[PDB]
Amino acid sequence: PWSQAETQSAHALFRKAYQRELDGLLATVQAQASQITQIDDLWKLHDFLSAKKHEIDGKYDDRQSVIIFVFAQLLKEGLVQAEELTFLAADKQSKIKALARL
Amino acid sequence: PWSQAETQSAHALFRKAYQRELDGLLATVQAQASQITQIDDLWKLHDFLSAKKHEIDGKYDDRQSVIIFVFAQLLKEGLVQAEELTFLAADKQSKIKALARL
Numbered sequence: 001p002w003s004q005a006e007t008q009s010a011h012a013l014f015r016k017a018y019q020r021e022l023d024g025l026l027a028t029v030q031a032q033a034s035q036i037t038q039i040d041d042l043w044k045l046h047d048f049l050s051a052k053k054h055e056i057d058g059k060y061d062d063r064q065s066v067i068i069f070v071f072a073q074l075l076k077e078g079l080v081q082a083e084e085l086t087f088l089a090a091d092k093q094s095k096i097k098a099l100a101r102l
Numbered sequence: 103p104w105s106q107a108e109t110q111s112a113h114a115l116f117r118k119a120y121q122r123e124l125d126g127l128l129a130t131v132q133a134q135a136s137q138i139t140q141i142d143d144l145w146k147l148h149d150f151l152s153a154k155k156h157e158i159d160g161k162y163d164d165r166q167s168v169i170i171f172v173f174a175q176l177l178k179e180g181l182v183q184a185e186e187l188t189f190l191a192a193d194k195q196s197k198i199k200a201l202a203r204l
Contacts, residue, residue, distance in 0.1 A: 022141055029144055033135035039124050042131065046155060049148045 002064060009087040010067060017079045018060055025052055068092065072099035104166070111189040112169070116162050119181035123161075127154060170194065174201035 032045045061070050074080045075096060085093045104112075131151065138144055163172055176182045177198055187195050 026138070026141060026144060029147075030135060030138060033132060036128065036132065039128070042128065042151070043155070046148075046151050049151065053145075053148065 003089070006088060007064075010071075011062065013080060013084055013087075014060070014062060014067070014070070017074045020079050021056065025056075068095055069099055071096045072102075076100045108190055108194075109164075112173075113164065115182060115186055115189075116164065116172075116176075118186070119176050120158070120162055122181050123158060123179075127158075170197055171201065173198045177202040 029045070029049065032041070032048065036042055036045070059070070059073065061067070071080070071085070075082065075085075082093070082097060085096060088096075131147065134143070134147060134150075138147070161172070161175075163169070173182070173187065173194075174197075177184065177187075184195075184199065187198060190198075
């Protein structure tokens with residue numbers, strides 16, 4: 001079903017993708033912040049933060065039975081690339097790449 | 103008993119204080135958003151932004167039951183100067199200052 005080395009590297013690229021979305025999030029927040037003029041910009045920021053937080057909290061399900069779909073989402077948002085999925089079994093990669101288009 | 107002038111000028115002052123708080127809030131946010139290094143300080147900010155927003159929404163209440171307390175507060179937080187209250191009756195000024203000194 002799931003090789004060990006598979007599971008390991010999976011959790012790895014998982015948390016790496018996490019760190020990536022974190023970097024992007026931080027960059028965007030700092031950017032928006034340093035370039036505000038109106039007060040409405042600040043509330044745009046606020047809304048952005050609530051949304052992104054909500055998203056991220058429920059996004060990164062680490063459980064095995066869902067990891068494929070999580071990976072799929074991450075790929076659909078380009079947080080990872082197909083080239084980074086080579087450490088998996090073939091059926092898994094094809095699965096992910098299929099679930100991506102949904 | 104609130105005369106027309108007292109109410110009108112009270113609203114003008116309320117708005118003045120509102121814009122002032124907007125400026126201060128803007129300054130603080132714009133500041134600590136440049137002092138971020140870690141990621142958790144991004145959430146503090148958020149929480150701050152999520153707290154201070156709920157405040158400002160329901161802070162400036164012009165109803166008779168609290169208006170004096172609102173002015174007292176706005177006086178403590180330096181959102182209004184004492185000399186801006188001179189349009190009010192003397193008793194009200196006294197009361198506001200009294201609630202503000204504590």
